[PDB]
Design an enzyme around this catalytic site. Structure first.
Site, PDB file in Angstrom:
ATOM      1  N   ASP A   1       0.849  -1.228   0.000  1.00  0.00           N
ATOM      2  CA  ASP A   1       0.000   0.000   0.000  1.00  0.00           C
ATOM      3  C   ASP A   1       0.873   1.263   0.000  1.00  0.00           C
ATOM      4  O   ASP A   1       0.374   2.308   0.425  1.00  0.00           O
ATOM      5  CB  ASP A   1      -0.929  -0.018   1.184  1.00  0.00           C
ATOM      6  CG  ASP A   1      -2.070   0.985   1.087  1.00  0.00           C
ATOM      7  OD1 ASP A   1      -2.468   1.390  -0.038  1.00  0.00           O
ATOM      8  OD2 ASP A   1      -2.591   1.319   2.182  1.00  0.00           O
TER       9      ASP A   1
ATOM     10  N   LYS B   1       2.792   3.461  -5.750  1.00  0.00           N
ATOM     11  CA  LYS B   1       2.297   2.427  -6.591  1.00  0.00           C
ATOM     12  C   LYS B   1       3.393   1.904  -7.567  1.00  0.00           C
ATOM     13  O   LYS B   1       3.336   0.734  -7.968  1.00  0.00           O
ATOM     14  CB  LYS B   1       1.023   2.847  -7.310  1.00  0.00           C
ATOM     15  CG  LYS B   1      -0.080   3.405  -6.411  1.00  0.00           C
ATOM     16  CD  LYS B   1      -0.298   2.517  -5.130  1.00  0.00           C
ATOM     17  CE  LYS B   1      -1.089   3.257  -4.104  1.00  0.00           C
ATOM     18  NZ  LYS B   1      -0.970   2.604  -2.758  1.00  0.00           N
TER      19      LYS B   1
ATOM     20  N   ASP C   1      -3.241  -3.160  -2.430  1.00  0.00           N
ATOM     21  CA  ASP C   1      -4.287  -2.142  -2.535  1.00  0.00           C
ATOM     22  C   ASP C   1      -4.219  -1.354  -3.847  1.00  0.00           C
ATOM     23  O   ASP C   1      -3.120  -1.256  -4.437  1.00  0.00           O
ATOM     24  CB  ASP C   1      -4.202  -1.139  -1.342  1.00  0.00           C
ATOM     25  CG  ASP C   1      -5.443  -0.280  -1.188  1.00  0.00           C
ATOM     26  OD1 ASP C   1      -6.517  -0.726  -1.603  1.00  0.00           O
ATOM     27  OD2 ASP C   1      -5.322   0.838  -0.601  1.00  0.00           O
ATOM     28  N   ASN C   2      -5.310  -0.773  -4.264  1.00  0.00           N
ATOM     29  CA  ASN C   2      -5.293   0.282  -5.314  1.00  0.00           C
ATOM     30  C   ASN C   2      -4.924  -0.241  -6.688  1.00  0.00           C
ATOM     31  O   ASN C   2      -4.364   0.511  -7.469  1.00  0.00           O
ATOM     32  CB  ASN C   2      -4.388   1.429  -4.908  1.00  0.00           C
ATOM     33  CG  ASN C   2      -4.725   2.026  -3.577  1.00  0.00           C
ATOM     34  OD1 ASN C   2      -3.884   2.011  -2.657  1.00  0.00           O
ATOM     35  ND2 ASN C   2      -5.935   2.514  -3.434  1.00  0.00           N
TER      36      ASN C   2
ATOM     37  N   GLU D   1     -11.580   4.125  -0.742  1.00  0.00           N
ATOM     38  CA  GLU D   1     -11.924   4.632   0.563  1.00  0.00           C
ATOM     39  C   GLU D   1     -12.704   5.881   0.485  1.00  0.00           C
ATOM     40  O   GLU D   1     -12.325   6.884  -0.154  1.00  0.00           O
ATOM     41  CB  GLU D   1     -10.623   4.779   1.404  1.00  0.00           C
ATOM     42  CG  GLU D   1      -9.518   5.580   0.742  1.00  0.00           C
ATOM     43  CD  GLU D   1      -8.452   4.777   0.032  1.00  0.00           C
ATOM     44  OE1 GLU D   1      -8.791   3.718  -0.543  1.00  0.00           O
ATOM     45  OE2 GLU D   1      -7.260   5.216   0.074  1.00  0.00           O
TER      46      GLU D   1
HETATM   47  C1  LIG Z   1      10.002   4.324  -1.611  1.00  0.00           C
HETATM   48  C2  LIG Z   1       9.144   3.097  -1.579  1.00  0.00           C
HETATM   49  N1  LIG Z   1       9.221   2.508  -0.206  1.00  0.00           N
HETATM   50  C3  LIG Z   1       8.491   2.913   0.819  1.00  0.00           C
HETATM   51  N2  LIG Z   1       8.801   2.377   2.039  1.00  0.00           N
HETATM   52  C4  LIG Z   1       8.108   2.790   3.137  1.00  0.00           C
HETATM   53  N3  LIG Z   1       7.101   3.671   3.202  1.00  0.00           N
HETATM   54  C5  LIG Z   1       6.816   4.149   1.954  1.00  0.00           C
HETATM   55  C6  LIG Z   1       7.468   3.853   0.767  1.00  0.00           C
HETATM   56  N4  LIG Z   1       6.835   4.541  -0.255  1.00  0.00           N
HETATM   57  C7  LIG Z   1       5.888   5.248   0.308  1.00  0.00           C
HETATM   58  N5  LIG Z   1       5.824   5.055   1.690  1.00  0.00           N
HETATM   59  C8  LIG Z   1       4.753   5.474   2.546  1.00  0.00           C
HETATM   60  O1  LIG Z   1       3.549   4.841   2.165  1.00  0.00           O
HETATM   61  C9  LIG Z   1       2.477   5.854   2.149  1.00  0.00           C
HETATM   62  C10 LIG Z   1       2.125   6.169   0.704  1.00  0.00           C
HETATM   63  C11 LIG Z   1       1.215   5.578   0.039  1.00  0.00           C
HETATM   64  C12 LIG Z   1       0.842   5.873  -1.389  1.00  0.00           C
HETATM   65  N6  LIG Z   1      -0.603   5.629  -1.588  1.00  0.00           N
HETATM   66  C13 LIG Z   1      -1.289   6.331  -2.468  1.00  0.00           C
HETATM   67  O2  LIG Z   1      -0.752   7.125  -3.204  1.00  0.00           O
HETATM   68  C14 LIG Z   1      -2.754   6.111  -2.460  1.00  0.00           C
HETATM   69  C15 LIG Z   1      -3.532   7.032  -3.225  1.00  0.00           C
HETATM   70  C16 LIG Z   1      -4.883   6.926  -3.297  1.00  0.00           C
HETATM   71  C17 LIG Z   1      -5.657   7.918  -4.114  1.00  0.00           C
HETATM   72  C18 LIG Z   1      -6.778   7.543  -4.851  1.00  0.00           C
HETATM   73  C19 LIG Z   1      -7.506   8.467  -5.559  1.00  0.00           C
HETATM   74  C20 LIG Z   1      -7.071   9.741  -5.592  1.00  0.00           C
HETATM   75  F1  LIG Z   1      -7.843  10.646  -6.340  1.00  0.00           F
HETATM   76  C21 LIG Z   1      -6.017  10.194  -4.907  1.00  0.00           C
HETATM   77  C22 LIG Z   1      -5.285   9.278  -4.187  1.00  0.00           C
HETATM   78  C23 LIG Z   1      -5.557   5.914  -2.556  1.00  0.00           C
HETATM   79  C24 LIG Z   1      -4.826   4.995  -1.797  1.00  0.00           C
HETATM   80  O3  LIG Z   1      -5.443   4.002  -1.115  1.00  0.00           O
HETATM   81  C25 LIG Z   1      -3.419   5.079  -1.760  1.00  0.00           C
HETATM   82  O4  LIG Z   1      -2.794   4.127  -1.067  1.00  0.00           O
HETATM   83  C26 LIG Z   1       2.987   7.056   2.927  1.00  0.00           C
HETATM   84  O5  LIG Z   1       2.747   6.913   4.306  1.00  0.00           O
HETATM   85  C27 LIG Z   1       4.458   6.968   2.528  1.00  0.00           C
HETATM   86  O6  LIG Z   1       5.347   7.716   3.397  1.00  0.00           O
HETATM   87 CL   LIG Z   2     -14.907   3.160   2.803  1.00  0.00          CL
HETATM   88 CL   LIG Z   3      -4.231   2.412   5.755  1.00  0.00          CL
HETATM   89 MG   LIG Z   4      -4.106   2.497  -0.588  1.00  0.00          MG
END
Ligand SMILES: CCNc1ncnc2c1ncn2[C@@H]1O[C@H](/C=C/CNC(=O)c2cc(-c3ccc(F)cc3)cc(O)c2O)[C@@H](O)[C@H]1O
Ligand SMILES: [Cl-]
Ligand SMILES: [Cl-]
Ligand SMILES: [Mg+2]
Length: 213
Positions: free
Chosen positions: A139, A142, A167-168, A197
């Site tokens: 999650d 992506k 997810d997603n 969500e």
């Molecule tokens: C560098 C890769 N490794 C990583 N290792 C550890 N933590 C990581 C990492 N990447 C990102 N993170 C963390 O994961 C999280 C990021 C998640 C990215 N998720 C999304 O972009 C996402 C985006 C949407 C979404 C859907 C529709 C939209 F219109 C706008 C956004 C819905 C979701 O359920 C999502 O999960 C943050 O907490 C970030 O700091």
């Molecule tokens: Cl929901």
């Molecule tokens: Cl979550």
């Molecule tokens: Mg997600």
């Protein structure tokens, strides 16, 4: 103050310490009524709960904790003695996740690892005494789902029957990952259609079970 900090404060002001369901409800309420956030949410969350109960994993890895919503969901369903490792690169979010899990009373089931998955995955065996993972929840960013799947395999952390749950896979989508697992003999895939969500927008989870090298 950030939106993530506001979610944590709302849970602290409105949920019951030691009651994970109350935490999940509080977060859902805040994110439906006040400010949207990218927690997995209740629709997809109920599918995740059904998968976790079906497989009863002893060791789960989550990539991307965010504010800890899915870590609360999963950890509350773990059998006694089973464990969750969750990786979160953003130090602020890692601390929020730790405090969310503390509030929920789940801190003894979860280890919150502050760092990027590409750095921490190669440390799991030696530093975190992992042999293989029973389940992985993806999650995070992506475009990192596929790189990290391939890293987990390289590192020896997948076994025959390891369950990946992503997810997603519809919104935002993870097209390289999805095409890869669906096309690979090394995975058996199942799609669970749901909703983004807090939104009336189709999304889905992909379950991809590793078949061995
Ligand atoms: C560098 C890769 N490794 C990583 N290792 C550890 N933590 C990581 C990492 N990447 C990102 N993170 C963390 O994961 C999280 C990021 C998640 C990215 N998720 C999304 O972009 C996402 C985006 C949407 C979404 C859907 C529709 C939209 F219109 C706008 C956004 C819905 C979701 O359920 C999502 O999960 C943050 O907490 C970030 O700091
Ligand atoms: Cl929901
Ligand atoms: Cl979550
Ligand atoms: Mg997600």
């Amino acid at each position: 103050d950030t939106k993530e900090q506001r979610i944590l404060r709302y849970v602290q002001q409105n949920a019951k310490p030691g009651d994970p369901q109350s935490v999940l409800e509080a977060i859902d309420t805040y994110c439906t009524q006040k400010e949207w956030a990218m927690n997995v949410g209740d629709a997809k969350g109920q599918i995740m709960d059904a998968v976790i109960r079906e497989y009863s994993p002893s060791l789960v890895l989550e990539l991307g904790a965010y504010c800890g919503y899915s870590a609360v969901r999963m950890a509350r369903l773990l059998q006694p003695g089973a464990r969750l490792l969750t990786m979160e690169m953003n130090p602020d979010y890692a601390a929020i996740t730790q405090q969310m899990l503390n509030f929920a009373g789940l801190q003894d089931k979860v280890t919150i690892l502050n760092g990027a998955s590409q750095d921490l995955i190669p440390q799991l065996k030696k530093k975190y005494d992992v042999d293989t993972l029973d389940m992985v929840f993806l999650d995070h960013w992506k475009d990192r789902y596929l790189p990290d799947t391939l890293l987990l395999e390289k590192c020896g952390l997948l076994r025959k029957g390891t369950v990946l749950l992503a997810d997603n896979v519809i919104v935002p989508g993870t097209p390289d990952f999805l095409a890869y697992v669906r096309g690979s003999s090394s995975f058996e895939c199942t799609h669970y259609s749901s909703y983004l969500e807090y939104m009336k927008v189709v999304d889905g989870l992909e379950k991809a079970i590793y078949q061995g090298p």
